[PDB]
Amino acid sequence: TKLKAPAVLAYSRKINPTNALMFAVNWSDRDNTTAVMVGTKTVAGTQSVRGNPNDADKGNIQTVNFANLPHNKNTLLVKYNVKFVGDVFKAELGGGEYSNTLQTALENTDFGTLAYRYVYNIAAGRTLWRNRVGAESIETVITVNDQTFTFSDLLVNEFDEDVDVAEIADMVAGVLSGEGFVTLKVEHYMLLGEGSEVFPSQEFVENSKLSKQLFDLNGQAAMHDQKIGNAIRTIDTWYEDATTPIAVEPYGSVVRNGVAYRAGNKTDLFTLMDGAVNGKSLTEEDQMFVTANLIRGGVFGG
């Protein structure tokens, strides 16, 4: 057989989230949504490393950025939408009897498991990633096709069992398997407190003198869409020495720890995919890893 990957084989993203929007309501009075903005604070000048006569001139166009909760309210309203799309076997670039063979090797994949897990991430509230710590009560209302589904205390790591999560997962799985689309409106409610430092998306700083650069949406505390997506992708539980679910990546390379959780014992996508294509019966949990990366998308050719 020896079918080789097309030099340019590429796939697209299926689960597409939007940006979050931070607002300030009251736990009882959820109607006074208040624009949480980003202010500036002094700090400029005196770059002040030891010696380093070269990078001591540094011109200063600096002001740190900070954001806090209005002292009249106590509840953070985080708001985003998630569009799930179908046709998970769409090879945009390439597609010459190789992605088609991968399609015929990944037909017996359990979309149900993946579906449940994706919805579970939302219900647990993994997107916060900073505001989560210290909250009194979290309330995640998921309006899937006009059905507001309020969730609350669900474990992050341990995938617990819930009928309502499975209900939304049914719709998600249908979209995932065939072709269709579903958008759910997620609104989180967290009793933080009056005057609580909220944590918006930190933004890339170059070689300047800033340490606090905040991403805002037209003067409003907001979180990045890519980070929200990474929180739903935290489901890899079939890796070398599987512990906590990690972000599904072809090489499993989380750069925060500088590791490689798939690149090691031939568990990386490329190996598994090539094997399946040329004729190697894979395990369910490892073929689902391949499907998860197809959903994620990317260049899987070369």
Partner: peptide, 14 residues
């Protein structure tokens, strides 16, 4: 406890 979400010393400081 092991916190992927946050800095461990940030939990220590909180």
């Amino acid at each position: 406890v092991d916190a992927d979400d946050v800095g461990v010393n940030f939990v220590v400081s909180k």
